[PDB]
Amino acid sequence: GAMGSMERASLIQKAKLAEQAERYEDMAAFMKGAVEKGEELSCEERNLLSVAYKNVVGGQRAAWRVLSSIEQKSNEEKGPEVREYREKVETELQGVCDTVLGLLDSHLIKEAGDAESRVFYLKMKGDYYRYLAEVATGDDKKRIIDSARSAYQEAMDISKKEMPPTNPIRLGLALNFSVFHYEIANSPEEAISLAKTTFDEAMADLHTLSEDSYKDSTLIMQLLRDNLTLWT
Amino acid sequence: GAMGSMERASLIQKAKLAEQAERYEDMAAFMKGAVEKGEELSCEERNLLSVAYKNVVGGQRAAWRVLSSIEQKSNEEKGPEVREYREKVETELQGVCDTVLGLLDSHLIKEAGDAESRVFYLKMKGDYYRYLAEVATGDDKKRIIDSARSAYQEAMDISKKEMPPTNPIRLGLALNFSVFHYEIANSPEEAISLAKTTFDEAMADLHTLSEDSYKDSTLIMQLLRDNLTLWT
Amino acid sequence: KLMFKTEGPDSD
Amino acid sequence: KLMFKTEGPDSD
Ligand SMILES: N=C(N)c1cc2c(Cl)cccc2s1
Ligand SMILES: N=C(N)c1cc2c(Cl)cccc2s1
Ligand SMILES: N=C(N)c1cc2c(Cl)cccc2s1
Ligand SMILES: N=C(N)c1cc2c(Cl)cccc2s1
Ligand SMILES: N=C(N)c1cc2c(Cl)cccc2s1
Ligand SMILES: N=C(N)c1cc2c(Cl)cccc2s1
Ligand SMILES: N=C(N)c1cc2c(Cl)cccc2s1
Ligand SMILES: N=C(N)c1cc2c(Cl)cccc2s1
Ligand SMILES: [Ca+2]
Ligand SMILES: [Ca+2]
Ligand SMILES: [Cl-]
Ligand SMILES: [Cl-]
Ligand SMILES: [Mg+2]
Ligand SMILES: [Mg+2]
Ligand SMILES: [Mg+2]
Ligand SMILES: [Mg+2]
Ligand SMILES: [Mg+2]
Ligand SMILES: [Mg+2]
Ligand SMILES: [Mg+2]
Ligand SMILES: [Mg+2]
């Protein structure tokens, strides 16, 4: 690993600097190096890992959708270029998803014993399978979808047993699993039911929160409301 | 070259697709490959080359300024990390400038005989020396500044002899040379004089233009006005 | 394509 | 730092 010679603390400091500089490819490479030190991640470090790769894969998903849309127009050939370049972006996206799933499998999920860490990592495993599902078309698409569902389901089971209904990790999980249902699993009723039950159970727990916890919870509850407004 | 096996026409098509996908690193790599085919560039192709690298170096300049500002705060040590990471971004910026100057020197400028092409390339040579000057501090800073001034000056001499005062390439040159004067050469009076004379000579030529040429000219004249409003 | 709200940076 | 207007994409 290219980050093998850098101190763990220096990798984390540099991930924070890369985030301020909007250098998300650098931020992800620093956090990959921090993970490969083999120590469990703190809550802040798990968030740095997630923010870095979400930004990198975000740019790739946006580029992929632009190229896929042009390819579809262009097949409704004018040569192989649009397909070749969509494939190049798709392969790069798949490699970033593969890298993140590799970090989770070696060995973040297996050492994560607290509900906060284990749910966080299982949610990420769900998300990166879901990003793979968005571009999957072959004999693999069913198996990728099932891998997303399995990770999200284990995260949901733990979150319901171990976390209050307003826990922002639990809320962000349920948000993401509901979007999975709506547009990957073709299960809009499941998506709506999950988003509604999640919203309503959080609403009833808000009275237990400080002003700071209340802001963190209601920010994610607003995303559930925004989706329900589009879906119903 | 990694693009050596791809058709020139396919590289240009893919540069256009990368631009739609906001994949500017890809766009620059495709246009570098197109340049290394050894054929002169059309006006559209010169603009694709310029847009690609301007976007790439733009992100690097923005990151560099963030890190330089933190480094300066941090010296008004807390370890070598801020300096190391600023140096990493600086070295990457310098390599992109080096790559562009290498394309101009091998062999875009020497085969460019028309005023439109030759001024375009000499302006770019000025710009990439200016980006190098923004981060230069050593025994090289004077020589880099002089290289920027020399390229901008040859471009200005040709543009005044060969192009009307409203020519958008001539206008964008004078804009950039005036900013060079203001904040690289420490010559604010030269910057203001250049921006004013350029604005006033363009104003007096607008009557000769079609509605489309008038929009192209007045868009750059607005940038000269915006700078003069900050400077006077 | 209409991307629904999901957790964290809206980076796409 | 206050970047003045220059030609083309304002990408910084
Ligand atoms: N963007 C970041 N650097 C961070 C995000 C978070 C979150 Cl969301 C929770 C706890 C800690 C952190 S640190
Ligand atoms: N962008 C940052 N520097 C930070 C973001 C957050 C969040 Cl989102 C929660 C708690 C802590 C932090 S620190
Ligand atoms: N890039 C991909 N298509 C995939 C990556 C992974 C990983 Cl890393 C584990 C299990 C399954 C998968 S599928
Ligand atoms: N629990 C319900 N009956 C519903 C809740 C919502 C919300 Cl919160 C937004 C839009 C639509 C709906 S329908
Ligand atoms: N962004 C682009 N693809 C292009 C920009 C220009 C300009 Cl500015 C002039 C003539 C042609 C072109 S093509
Ligand atoms: N972004 C694009 N696709 C284009 C931009 C321009 C400009 Cl700026 C001038 C003449 C032509 C073009 S085509
Ligand atoms: N990266 C750099 N510092 C420089 C690049 C170039 C080039 Cl390519 C030619 C003449 C001078 C210079 S200085
Ligand atoms: N030629 C002049 N006297 C000046 C022209 C301008 C403009 Cl155009 C903007 C702001 C300030 C000034 S002073
Ligand atoms: Ca997508
Ligand atoms: Ca700069
Ligand atoms: Cl390609
Ligand atoms: Cl570094
Ligand atoms: Mg490494
Ligand atoms: Mg150590
Ligand atoms: Mg593929
Ligand atoms: Mg129904
Ligand atoms: Mg090449
Ligand atoms: Mg050929
Ligand atoms: Mg240096
Ligand atoms: Mg004076």
Do residues A211 and A162 make contact, with C-beta atoms less than 8 angstroms apart?
no
- Residue given tokens 């005023």 in the structure block: B115
Cβ atoms of B228 and B176 closer than 8 Å:
no
Q: Tell me the C-alpha distance between B172 and A148, whole Å.
A: 51
Return the residue whose CA atom lies nearest to atom 10 of ligand 1: A44
CA proximity to A127, closest of A29, A57, A41, A63: A57
- CATH architecture of structural domain B8-231: Up-down Bundle (1.20)
Contact call for residues B45 and B12 (beta carbons, < 8 A): yes
Three-class HEC string of B12-47: HHHHHHHHHCCCHHHHHHHHHHHHHCCCCCCHHHHH
Instruction: Starting from the CA of residue A104, give the closest ligand.
Output: 3
Q: Which ligand is nearest to the CA of B9?
A: 18
Query: Would you put residue A6 in left (φ > 0), alpha (ψ -120 to 50) or beta?
Result: beta
The resolution, in Å, is: 1.9
Question: CB-CB: which of B22, B59, B82 is closest to A17?
Answer: B82
Tokens of B85: 């990471």
φ and ψ at residue B117, rounded to 5 degrees: -70, -50
- D11 contacts on B by Cβ (under 8 Å): 24, 54-59, 62
Please tell me what DSSP assigns to residue B2.
T
Full 3-state SS string of chain A: CCCCCCCHHHHHHHHHHHHHCCCHHHHHHHHHHHHHCCCCCCHHHHHHHHHHHHHHHHHHHHHHHHHHHHHHHHHCCCCCHHHHHHHHHHHHHHHHHHHHHHHHHHHHHHHCCCHHHHHHHHHHHHHHHHHHHHHCCCCCHHHHHHHHHHHHHHHHHHHHHHCCCCCHHHHHHHHHHHHHHHHCCCCHHHHHHHHHHHHHHHHCCHHHCCHHHHHHHHHHHHHHHHHHHHHC
Neighbours of chain B (3+ CB pairs under 8 A): A, D
DSSP 8-state code for residue D7: S
Q: Which residues, in sequence order, are CB contacts of D8 under 8 Å at separation 6+?
A: B50, B51, B54, B172
The domain segmentation of chain A, as residue ranges, is: 8-231
Residue whose pair of structure tokens reads 């394309």 in the numeric block: B103
Cα atoms in the Cβ-side hemisphere of radius 13 Å centred on B51? 18
Which residues sit with Cβ closer than 5 angstroms to ligand 18, an ion?
A: B 7
Identify the CA nearest to B62 among candidates D2, A164, D12, A160.
D12
- Residue bearing the CA closest to ligand 3, atom 12: A98
Taking the CA of residue A196 as reference, the ligand 4 atom at the shortest distance is 1
Residues in chain B: 232
| Tally of CA atoms within 13 A in the half-sphere of A35 that contains its CB | 28
What three-state secondary structure class fits C12? Answer: coil
Question: Do you know the residue count of chain C?
Answer: 12
Pairwise CA distance, residues A36 & B92, whole Å: 25
- Of all residues in chain B, the one with the smallest CA distance to D12 is B58
Neighbour subunits, C (≥3 Cβ pairs < 8 A): A
| Three-state secondary structure string covering B161-212 | HHCCCCCHHHHHHHHHHHHHHHHCCCCHHHHHHHHHHHHHHHHCCHHHCCHH
Residue with tokens 């850098």: A6
Method: X-ray
The whole-angstrom separation of Cα A115 and Cα A111 is: 12
Query: Is the dihedral angle over the CA atoms A141, A143, A144, A145 positive or is it negative?
Result: positive
Residue B181 preceded by cis peptide, ω within 30? no
> How does DSSP classify residue B11?
H
